């Protein structure tokens, strides 16, 4: 064998090649036409290219010889991120820039043929308005956030009112702290729980003959949370912004629950508002809870629910919270004494389902609730990894029992006093595969036919196929998407059509509309049909040779998957240099059968310079159950590279053109962390390491993430020590050219402190580094000029220290 | 000629190279002479001084005669037993006062109670203060009393009655940064970094006697209000915490601190106990009495304690004033408006500030520590000696006499004073020195005045710009400036208070720093004439250092008119036929001369270590440097960055003709602070000359630097749009090389002077202009690199960078 060498370009010549070589539809919704005679069945509304609202028409019959391309009809007159709806009126609502707008299409006021004009919601608010949500009960009321407080605005009467008076926007950060109706830093980053207020879909009637609308919300008080100083984006000022960051082992925000009551008289104006806190403290009612993972209302509207975790995140609880638990707020001490006794004892919180595990609770969106079937029962579907070790739907019926705790007593509650008995727990699915419940995946639930649809890993972990099965008497799981592709699917609310954003490794991404059929003898059975196309493909894209997906049976008893990009125009005899992209952290799988030319376009660019690009999903990656993910608990850093080195040596034996005297590693966030761990642990295997936003020291990262995977720092001092590359600075090479550090100077998530503190110890260890800073970038890179420079320095750094003979000369 | 290429060592090898090279390796200061007054005794004087074994007070015995056959070494008798930066002394009682860490201690020696023959135990001054007590000062009138600062307020403490008392209630320590930020007795950031004025309060040297038998002491003090000053954030040394400390930094063009004089009258009874302390504001605002003044440069008191004096600059630093301020100008602080109005009218209109000297210049005023007031001979006049470049363009001594006239300004009348209303007439202004050379007045250089013989001793550049020398001259009939120090060495000097001895710390390019005592005699026929004699050695030289070839001081007649000096490090073992890679070291900014006849082996050791590995090392002092007059220095006024490289190149090209071993196709440049600024400018302006540029803590953008410096040399930003733009490398990022392995930035992450945002914002524009950089951060370091482990890693990454991108053949291959 004789080593291949890559093109020694200049700096500007590399900028040439990048500069030269150069979003999908989403948020679908279905509305049927109520059309006695006419042709079209449905009219859908969705978001795509500024990025705004489109609509389309679904024909009742198609010429099955030809392929129907559906038309992108524009819904608006002239981006848009997330919209709301109310079918009973047709009332839309959405955000675009600072302003909020509304139209009508479907309901009592017709189907518009042409693009209807966007009518604005006017305001008496001094600041930007965030997170607009429609009330289902009243189609005319909406709610939104303004300076960490909830307002409501009426888009016909033009009547506005501030509901929560918590955040004093004139007072500064250090003294203020509180919020009401927004999620904190942790709950948005680590739990994808972006909103913090939820409308009630019903309204109680008053003695005057009107209604009372309801809004649930949490009240965070971040007073004990650590203040941290990130540098301000305007480097001109030479100042830093103070923002709250609950570091591992420190206090999280003082969470507690609240609820509103808006009396609307017969005319439609607000009578009088009542703001309501809990009957007792959050510590006493919900004992040992330290996070509010999700919340919302029952379709009934009688109970408001919330999923609640303990601090270590090893105890999920689903609790029902009836509005009769809340009382109005009062400064008068003995008036509240009277308010508490008038509320009964039997009106009590109800833990309808508790579960534990010695790994962790992965929080998911899936929680369908059925209408109140029997009197003191609640039928509901829920997902859980706890039982089998894999996420499966369990139909549960919990007895809504009167509590053994009476607050009148004076005594304090025991741990089991709000635990409901279980009538049943029917496992709807089962196996060595999971149901998906994050990133827009959930469950479409037919209640007449009594079915349930879902995404999962049944056919393969590499493909996210659509599946269907009954919830009453469950059994066989019917696949609804063609093999070889991966699918992020959306089913109709009427269960007759479904749309499937799909791609694979060779062919780019598309979208397709599909019709579901069902024999009239048997509701259970369902078959699909290729109905239409919403977006045609980009074809075998020019200059793009993808990687062939490989798997290998690991020495740890797992089928570890991987992507292998081979050098474009392959030379037998001449072995090539090798580069290894990586993330290998929780909540993320890189290797699946999907088009990796969109986001991972550069990997292909490296393949067309003579770099062997390899990618592996080590133990810890998602979509493969709790036991596979759970491998690294308390042991982040320690195992991951050994899986990568193993999977690399499978490619080394099979394909000997991979030169293991020229091995490079690169990644972002956790990816950069492992890239440092690679060079630190395996100096012998790995030549160069390029660390993007490296987590160098786990005591600096937030609670929500780190306590989940590593526990509380005090009870795992070694796991933190071993998992923190900053401590182990002496273990790095005494050889330059092998350690590049890349980091955004304004990083809120993986603080630049990680890099600076690592560098501090690297300096006193006497260890060389190379370093680039992108001073205008936060966590990722969200500016063209920075991104251009990153890629430009990446390819040149590899060229100068891995690929070409000048790099071979440096040793 | 064929190229030379340096030997490639690894990172691991060079670390050992630099370690071993350093495997080997503070002088005395703050001297004082006290007479033994022992006719029978063998010693005339005893000298006290600060030095290291731990920096502390020592002493030696100065004999009345010596064995002139051999060299007498002086025994360093330690005064103490338990770091002392500075110390105070009262001649009358023999009382030492000095901060040492947290505590403020005192001992007695050499006064009326005699001279000890062993160490003395330091006696702590006890305290109710929670925090560390900074800036101790003995009251000259009463050595029982002292003053100090605590949380930016003046406290006084008696060291026998144990009485303590806070004198100012300005800064409240429990309240945070933004909501408070006032101070009394303390010098602000700008006054310490740019003007080297470290104290902000001054004891009135004499005591007034009350009718009862007690006495009044006085402390003049500066009261600063930093409310309007820019609050800048720098990262906290505790990286652990991931926080940033706030402090006040007047950026170029922004608000400076708002200042004023205040006086504290301390009435003490006949027992030594505080009766009452009155705090006194000025009778009119500082804005009105001192029109135009931005900085209180220096302050103090006349010998008699009759007037407080003050040296005052306007914001542009073109106008300087010396103003006498009577204590009668200060009236008590009264909230009661009817009471104040009476206290205003109590003071006569005839009492008024006295601008006893005023001068302008179109270049700038360099502040200095030379100012000597005489005994008051005539009752409505004052004599003094002062230094100035404003007359000839070179810093010289002038014996000014000023007439303390009554002002035409009466406060009574109600209006504001005219610009000339406080200006005294100058009765005479005798020039004591003159020529194209300067007297020195900073970094401890100062005059000593023999008031009996009517002479003045001083340091200057008369013989050479490369050698500081002591001189003596009359101030009555000034003429022959007699040199006292021996030629061939440069001299930092100290003269005895009795003018019969002088100490020198001297060195030269070959010989390390030696410290010698010399005795000053005079012949009976002419007391104007003075002659020295080698009396003893205080500190002996370390002797020419092993493996240190010192450089040679060259010079060239520049095309700009001036005789520019430099230093040349020839590579060790020259190979005729082979041409070496060149490394240009630079500061090349104001207030600094690198090139002079001193031993550069201590500080600039690695310039030699570069030469031993086969690098030519050049250092040039371009137009802007100190010690060559104001005209020379002024060169880059409004033009920083624009002219310095032209001088550096010209010197480099001068060396290239005289020596062909300079490979001009492989030349690098390196420097710190202003050195790093010009190192960036070298690459930005002269790509063709300079392969690599290694820039330490570089000033990238002049609006981000402080008022006191930046406006001195560049004026107000509004008044010099172009000079700022052209002088700011951050604003000209597009003009950098697209070739990598040329630009290297170094910067201390915790820097207070040249904030790291200079470097970060340069990178911001280098990125969005697609230009490559290399970077090293030193996260535990401020402006200069302090921690030894951090310094070694800089020295290492310097040599390796030079090796891979300039020196060795692997660098040549990279094209």
Coordinates of C-alpha atoms in Angstrom, one line a residue, chain B residues 116-584:
Chain B
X116 CA 19.5 49.8 66.7
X117 CA 22.2 47.1 66.3
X118 CA 19.6 44.3 65.5
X119 CA 16.2 43.7 63.9
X120 CA 13.1 45.5 65.2
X121 CA 9.7 43.9 65.5
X122 CA 7.0 45.4 63.2
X123 CA 4.2 47.0 65.3
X124 CA 0.7 46.5 63.8
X125 CA -1.7 49.5 63.8
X126 CA -5.0 48.0 65.1
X127 CA -8.3 48.5 63.3
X128 CA -12.1 48.4 63.4
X129 CA -12.0 48.3 59.6
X130 CA -13.3 45.1 58.0
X131 CA -11.4 45.5 54.7
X132 CA -7.7 45.9 53.7
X133 CA -6.2 49.3 54.5
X134 CA -4.5 50.9 51.5
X135 CA -2.1 53.9 51.1
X136 CA -0.7 54.6 54.6
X137 CA 0.8 58.1 55.2
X138 CA 2.5 59.5 58.3
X139 CA 1.4 63.0 59.2
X140 CA 4.6 65.1 59.0
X141 CA 3.5 67.5 61.7
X142 CA 2.5 64.7 64.2
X143 CA 4.2 61.3 63.8
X144 CA 1.6 59.8 66.3
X145 CA -1.1 60.3 63.6
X146 CA -1.3 58.5 60.3
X147 CA -3.9 58.3 57.4
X148 CA -5.0 55.5 55.2
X149 CA -7.8 54.6 52.7
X150 CA -10.5 52.1 53.5
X151 CA -13.3 51.4 50.9
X152 CA -12.4 54.6 49.0
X153 CA -12.6 56.8 52.1
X154 CA -9.9 58.5 54.2
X155 CA -9.4 57.1 57.7
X156 CA -6.9 58.4 60.3
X157 CA -5.5 56.4 63.2
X158 CA -3.3 57.3 66.1
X159 CA -0.5 54.8 66.8
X160 CA -0.3 55.5 70.6
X161 CA -3.8 56.5 71.7
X162 CA -5.3 53.8 69.4
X163 CA -8.0 56.2 68.2
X164 CA -9.4 55.5 64.8
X165 CA -11.8 57.8 62.7
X166 CA -13.4 57.8 59.3
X167 CA -13.0 61.2 57.7
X168 CA -15.0 60.9 54.5
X169 CA -18.5 59.3 54.0
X170 CA -18.6 59.1 50.2
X171 CA -18.4 55.4 49.2
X172 CA -20.8 53.0 50.9
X173 CA -19.2 49.5 50.5
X174 CA -22.5 47.5 51.0
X175 CA -24.2 49.1 48.0
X176 CA -23.1 47.8 44.6
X177 CA -21.2 49.2 41.5
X178 CA -23.7 51.4 39.5
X179 CA -25.8 52.8 42.4
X180 CA -22.7 54.3 44.3
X181 CA -19.3 54.8 42.5
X182 CA -17.9 57.8 44.3
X183 CA -14.5 58.0 46.1
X184 CA -12.2 60.2 48.2
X185 CA -8.4 60.0 48.7
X186 CA -8.0 57.7 45.7
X187 CA -6.6 58.2 42.2
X188 CA -8.9 57.0 39.3
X189 CA -7.9 54.4 36.7
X190 CA -6.7 57.0 34.1
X191 CA -4.5 58.9 36.7
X192 CA -2.8 55.7 37.7
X193 CA -2.2 54.1 34.3
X194 CA -1.5 57.2 32.2
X195 CA -0.3 59.8 34.7
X196 CA 1.3 57.6 37.4
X197 CA -0.3 59.4 40.3
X198 CA -1.2 56.7 42.8
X199 CA -2.3 58.7 45.9
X200 CA -5.3 61.1 46.1
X201 CA -4.7 62.7 49.5
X202 CA -1.9 64.9 51.0
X203 CA -1.1 65.7 54.6
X204 CA -0.6 69.4 55.4
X205 CA 3.1 69.3 56.6
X206 CA 2.6 71.8 59.5
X207 CA 0.2 72.1 62.4
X208 CA -1.8 75.2 63.4
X209 CA -2.1 75.8 67.2
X210 CA -5.6 76.4 68.7
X211 CA -6.0 78.9 71.6
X212 CA -6.7 76.1 74.1
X213 CA -3.3 74.4 73.6
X214 CA -4.5 71.8 71.0
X215 CA -3.9 71.9 67.3
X216 CA -5.4 71.6 63.8
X217 CA -4.1 69.1 61.2
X218 CA -5.2 69.2 57.5
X219 CA -5.6 66.7 54.7
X220 CA -6.2 68.0 51.1
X221 CA -7.9 65.3 49.1
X222 CA -9.3 64.6 45.6
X223 CA -13.0 63.7 45.6
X224 CA -14.0 61.8 42.4
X225 CA -17.5 61.1 41.1
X226 CA -17.5 58.3 38.5
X227 CA -21.3 58.2 37.9
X228 CA -20.9 59.4 34.3
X229 CA -17.9 57.2 33.4
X230 CA -18.4 54.2 31.1
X231 CA -19.1 50.9 33.1
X232 CA -17.0 48.3 31.2
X233 CA -17.2 44.5 31.9
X234 CA -14.0 42.3 31.9
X235 CA -14.1 38.6 32.7
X236 CA -13.6 37.6 36.3
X237 CA -10.2 35.8 37.1
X238 CA -12.4 33.1 38.7
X239 CA -13.3 31.5 35.3
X240 CA -15.0 28.8 37.4
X241 CA -17.8 31.3 38.1
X242 CA -18.2 32.5 34.4
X243 CA -18.9 36.1 35.6
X244 CA -17.5 39.5 34.6
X245 CA -16.2 42.2 37.0
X246 CA -17.4 45.8 36.3
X247 CA -15.2 48.8 36.5
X248 CA -15.0 52.5 35.4
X249 CA -13.1 53.1 32.1
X250 CA -13.2 56.5 30.4
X251 CA -13.1 55.6 26.7
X252 CA -11.6 58.1 24.2
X253 CA -14.1 60.9 23.9
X254 CA -16.4 59.8 26.8
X255 CA -16.9 61.5 30.1
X256 CA -13.9 61.4 32.5
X257 CA -14.4 61.4 36.3
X258 CA -15.9 64.6 37.7
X259 CA -13.3 65.9 40.3
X260 CA -12.9 68.4 43.0
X261 CA -10.5 69.3 45.9
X262 CA -11.7 69.0 49.5
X263 CA -10.0 69.6 52.8
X264 CA -10.5 67.9 56.2
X265 CA -9.6 70.0 59.2
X266 CA -9.0 67.7 62.2
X267 CA -9.1 69.6 65.5
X268 CA -7.0 67.7 68.1
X269 CA -6.9 68.7 71.8
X270 CA -3.7 68.9 73.9
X271 CA -3.9 65.2 74.9
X272 CA -3.8 63.9 71.3
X273 CA -7.6 63.2 71.0
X274 CA -10.0 64.2 68.2
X275 CA -12.2 67.1 69.3
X276 CA -14.0 67.4 65.9
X277 CA -13.5 66.9 62.2
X278 CA -14.9 69.4 59.7
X279 CA -15.1 68.5 56.1
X280 CA -14.7 71.4 53.7
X281 CA -15.9 72.0 50.1
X282 CA -14.4 74.7 47.8
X283 CA -16.0 78.1 48.2
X284 CA -17.0 77.9 44.5
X285 CA -17.3 74.9 42.1
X286 CA -14.1 73.3 40.7
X287 CA -15.5 74.1 37.3
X288 CA -15.4 77.8 38.0
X289 CA -12.2 78.3 40.1
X290 CA -10.2 76.1 37.7
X291 CA -11.8 76.8 34.3
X292 CA -10.9 74.3 31.6
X293 CA -9.2 71.7 33.9
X294 CA -9.8 68.0 33.3
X295 CA -7.1 66.2 35.2
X296 CA -5.4 66.9 38.6
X297 CA -2.0 65.7 37.5
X298 CA -0.1 66.2 40.8
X299 CA -0.7 67.8 44.1
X300 CA 0.9 68.7 47.5
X301 CA 1.8 71.4 49.9
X302 CA 4.4 74.2 50.1
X303 CA 7.2 73.8 52.8
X304 CA 5.4 76.2 55.2
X305 CA 2.0 74.6 54.8
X306 CA 0.7 78.0 53.8
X307 CA -0.6 77.0 50.4
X308 CA -1.5 73.7 48.9
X309 CA -0.1 73.4 45.3
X310 CA -1.5 71.6 42.3
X311 CA -0.6 70.8 38.7
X312 CA -3.5 71.0 36.3
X313 CA -4.1 69.9 32.7
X314 CA -7.1 70.8 30.4
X315 CA -8.7 67.9 28.6
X316 CA -6.5 68.3 25.4
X317 CA -3.3 68.3 27.6
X318 CA -1.9 71.3 25.8
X319 CA -2.3 73.7 28.7
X320 CA -0.6 73.0 32.1
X321 CA -1.0 75.2 35.2
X322 CA 0.6 75.3 38.6
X323 CA -2.0 76.7 41.0
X324 CA -1.5 77.6 44.7
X325 CA -4.7 77.0 46.7
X326 CA -5.1 78.6 50.2
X327 CA -6.9 76.6 52.9
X328 CA -9.2 79.7 53.3
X329 CA -10.8 78.7 49.9
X330 CA -12.4 75.7 51.6
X331 CA -15.5 76.3 53.7
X332 CA -17.5 73.6 55.7
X333 CA -20.1 71.4 54.1
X334 CA -23.5 72.8 55.2
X335 CA -26.9 71.6 54.0
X336 CA -28.5 74.7 55.5
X337 CA -28.6 77.2 52.6
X338 CA -28.8 80.3 54.9
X339 CA -25.7 79.1 56.8
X340 CA -23.7 78.4 53.6
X341 CA -24.5 81.9 52.2
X342 CA -23.0 83.4 55.4
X343 CA -19.9 81.1 55.2
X344 CA -19.4 82.2 51.6
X345 CA -19.5 85.9 52.7
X346 CA -17.2 85.2 55.7
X347 CA -14.2 84.6 53.3
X348 CA -12.6 87.7 51.7
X349 CA -12.7 88.3 48.0
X350 CA -8.9 88.8 48.1
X351 CA -8.6 85.1 48.8
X352 CA -8.5 83.5 45.4
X353 CA -6.6 80.8 43.5
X354 CA -3.1 81.7 42.2
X355 CA -2.0 80.3 38.9
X356 CA 1.8 80.8 39.7
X357 CA 2.8 79.3 36.3
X358 CA 1.0 78.5 33.0
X359 CA 2.3 77.1 29.7
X360 CA 1.0 75.8 26.4
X361 CA 2.2 73.6 23.6
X362 CA 1.0 72.4 20.2
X363 CA 2.4 68.9 20.8
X364 CA 1.6 67.8 24.4
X365 CA 2.4 68.2 28.1
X366 CA 4.4 65.3 29.5
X367 CA 3.7 65.2 33.3
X368 CA 6.8 64.8 35.5
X369 CA 7.7 64.6 39.2
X370 CA 10.1 67.6 39.2
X371 CA 8.7 70.5 41.3
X372 CA 10.6 72.1 44.1
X373 CA 9.4 75.1 46.2
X374 CA 11.8 77.2 48.3
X375 CA 11.5 78.9 51.6
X376 CA 9.4 82.0 51.4
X377 CA 11.9 84.8 51.3
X378 CA 9.6 87.7 50.2
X379 CA 6.1 87.4 51.8
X380 CA 4.1 88.2 48.6
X381 CA 6.3 86.1 46.2
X382 CA 7.3 82.5 45.6
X383 CA 10.4 80.9 44.1
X384 CA 10.4 77.4 42.6
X385 CA 12.2 75.1 40.1
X386 CA 10.1 73.5 37.4
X387 CA 10.8 71.4 34.3
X388 CA 9.3 72.0 30.8
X389 CA 9.6 71.1 27.1
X390 CA 7.3 74.0 26.2
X391 CA 10.1 76.6 25.9
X392 CA 12.8 74.9 23.7
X393 CA 11.2 71.6 22.9
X394 CA 13.5 69.8 25.3
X395 CA 12.8 69.2 29.1
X396 CA 14.9 71.8 31.1
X397 CA 14.9 73.3 34.6
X398 CA 13.7 76.9 35.1
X399 CA 14.0 78.8 38.4
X400 CA 10.7 80.8 38.2
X401 CA 9.7 83.5 40.7
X402 CA 6.0 84.5 40.7
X403 CA 4.3 87.4 42.4
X404 CA 1.3 86.5 44.6
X405 CA -0.9 89.5 43.6
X406 CA -4.4 90.2 44.8
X407 CA -7.0 89.2 42.1
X408 CA -9.3 91.7 40.4
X409 CA -12.0 89.1 40.9
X410 CA -14.5 89.6 43.7
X411 CA -17.1 86.8 44.3
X412 CA -19.3 89.4 46.0
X413 CA -20.0 91.1 42.6
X414 CA -21.7 87.8 41.6
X415 CA -20.4 87.2 38.1
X416 CA -17.8 84.6 36.8
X417 CA -14.1 85.3 36.6
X418 CA -12.3 86.0 33.4
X419 CA -9.7 83.6 31.9
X420 CA -6.7 85.7 33.1
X421 CA -8.1 86.8 36.5
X422 CA -6.1 84.3 38.6
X423 CA -2.8 84.5 36.6
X424 CA 0.1 85.8 38.7
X425 CA 2.9 87.9 37.1
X426 CA 6.2 86.1 36.6
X427 CA 8.9 88.3 38.2
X428 CA 11.7 86.2 36.7
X429 CA 12.2 82.9 34.8
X430 CA 15.9 82.0 34.8
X431 CA 16.7 79.0 32.5
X432 CA 19.0 76.7 34.5
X433 CA 19.7 74.1 31.8
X434 CA 19.5 74.3 28.0
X435 CA 20.5 72.4 24.9
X436 CA 19.2 69.6 22.6
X437 CA 18.9 67.0 25.4
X438 CA 16.4 66.5 28.2
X439 CA 16.3 66.4 32.0
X440 CA 14.5 63.3 33.3
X441 CA 11.4 63.5 35.6
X442 CA 9.6 60.2 35.7
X443 CA 10.2 56.6 36.9
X444 CA 12.0 57.9 40.0
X445 CA 14.2 60.4 38.1
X446 CA 14.0 63.8 39.9
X447 CA 16.0 66.8 41.1
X448 CA 17.8 67.3 44.4
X449 CA 18.3 70.9 45.5
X450 CA 21.3 71.9 47.7
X451 CA 19.6 75.0 49.2
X452 CA 22.8 76.0 51.2
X453 CA 25.3 75.8 48.3
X454 CA 22.5 76.8 45.8
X455 CA 22.9 73.9 43.4
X456 CA 20.7 71.3 41.8
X457 CA 21.5 67.6 41.0
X458 CA 19.5 66.0 38.2
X459 CA 19.4 63.1 35.6
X460 CA 19.7 63.8 31.9
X461 CA 20.7 62.8 28.4
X462 CA 23.3 65.5 27.8
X463 CA 26.2 63.2 27.0
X464 CA 24.1 60.8 25.0
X465 CA 20.4 59.7 24.4
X466 CA 21.6 56.1 25.1
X467 CA 23.0 57.0 28.6
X468 CA 21.2 58.6 31.6
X469 CA 23.7 60.5 33.8
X470 CA 23.7 62.5 37.0
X471 CA 24.7 66.1 36.7
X472 CA 25.0 69.1 39.0
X473 CA 24.6 72.9 38.3
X474 CA 24.0 76.2 40.1
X475 CA 20.6 77.8 40.1
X476 CA 21.9 81.3 41.0
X477 CA 24.3 82.0 38.1
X478 CA 23.8 78.8 36.0
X479 CA 26.5 77.8 33.5
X480 CA 28.7 74.7 33.5
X481 CA 26.6 71.5 33.8
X482 CA 29.1 69.2 35.6
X483 CA 28.7 65.5 35.1
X484 CA 29.1 63.3 38.2
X485 CA 28.5 59.8 36.8
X486 CA 31.1 57.8 34.9
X487 CA 30.7 57.4 31.1
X488 CA 29.9 54.1 29.3
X489 CA 27.1 53.0 31.7
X490 CA 23.5 54.2 32.0
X491 CA 22.5 55.5 35.5
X492 CA 19.3 55.5 37.5
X493 CA 20.4 57.7 40.5
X494 CA 19.6 58.9 44.0
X495 CA 21.2 61.8 45.8
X496 CA 21.4 62.1 49.6
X497 CA 19.1 64.7 51.3
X498 CA 22.3 66.4 52.7
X499 CA 23.9 66.4 49.2
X500 CA 27.1 64.8 50.4
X501 CA 26.5 61.3 48.8
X502 CA 24.8 59.8 45.8
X503 CA 23.9 56.2 44.9
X504 CA 23.7 54.9 41.4
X505 CA 22.2 51.7 39.9
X506 CA 24.2 51.5 36.7
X507 CA 24.7 49.0 33.8
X508 CA 25.7 48.7 30.2
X509 CA 25.0 46.4 27.2
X510 CA 27.6 43.9 28.4
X511 CA 27.8 44.4 32.3
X512 CA 24.7 43.6 34.4
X513 CA 23.3 46.1 37.0
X514 CA 25.6 47.2 39.8
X515 CA 24.8 49.6 42.6
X516 CA 27.5 51.8 44.1
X517 CA 27.7 54.6 46.7
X518 CA 29.7 57.7 45.9
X519 CA 30.8 60.5 48.2
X520 CA 30.4 64.1 47.1
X521 CA 33.3 66.5 48.1
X522 CA 33.9 70.1 47.2
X523 CA 37.1 72.1 47.1
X524 CA 37.2 75.1 49.6
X525 CA 38.0 77.7 46.8
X526 CA 34.7 77.1 45.1
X527 CA 31.6 75.4 46.7
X528 CA 29.8 75.6 43.3
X529 CA 32.2 72.9 42.1
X530 CA 31.5 69.3 43.2
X531 CA 33.6 66.1 42.9
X532 CA 32.7 62.5 43.6
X533 CA 34.6 59.5 44.9
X534 CA 34.0 55.7 44.9
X535 CA 33.0 55.2 48.5
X536 CA 31.6 51.6 48.5
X537 CA 29.6 49.0 46.7
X538 CA 26.0 48.3 47.8
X539 CA 25.3 45.6 45.3
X540 CA 27.9 43.9 43.1
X541 CA 27.3 43.0 39.5
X542 CA 26.3 39.5 38.5
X543 CA 29.1 39.5 35.8
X544 CA 28.6 39.0 32.1
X545 CA 25.9 36.3 31.7
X546 CA 26.8 32.8 30.5
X547 CA 25.6 32.1 26.9
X548 CA 24.4 35.7 26.4
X549 CA 25.9 37.5 23.4
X550 CA 24.7 41.1 23.9
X551 CA 23.6 43.0 20.7
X552 CA 25.4 45.9 19.1
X553 CA 23.9 49.4 19.2
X554 CA 23.8 50.7 15.6
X555 CA 22.4 53.9 14.2
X556 CA 21.5 55.5 10.9
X557 CA 20.8 59.1 9.5
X558 CA 17.2 58.9 8.5
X559 CA 15.5 60.5 5.5
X560 CA 13.1 62.2 7.9
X561 CA 15.9 64.1 9.5
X562 CA 16.7 62.3 12.7
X563 CA 19.4 59.9 13.8
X564 CA 17.5 56.7 14.5
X565 CA 19.1 54.1 16.8
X566 CA 18.6 50.4 17.0
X567 CA 20.0 47.1 18.2
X568 CA 21.4 44.1 16.2
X569 CA 21.6 40.5 17.3
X570 CA 23.8 38.7 14.9
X571 CA 23.3 34.9 14.8
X572 CA 25.9 32.9 16.8
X573 CA 28.5 31.1 14.6
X574 CA 27.9 33.0 11.3
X575 CA 28.3 31.0 8.1
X576 CA 29.6 33.2 5.3
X577 CA 27.6 32.3 2.2
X578 CA 24.4 31.7 4.2
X579 CA 21.6 34.3 4.9
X580 CA 19.6 34.0 8.1
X581 CA 15.8 34.6 8.9
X582 CA 15.1 37.9 10.6
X583 CA 12.9 38.7 13.6
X584 CA 12.1 42.4 14.3

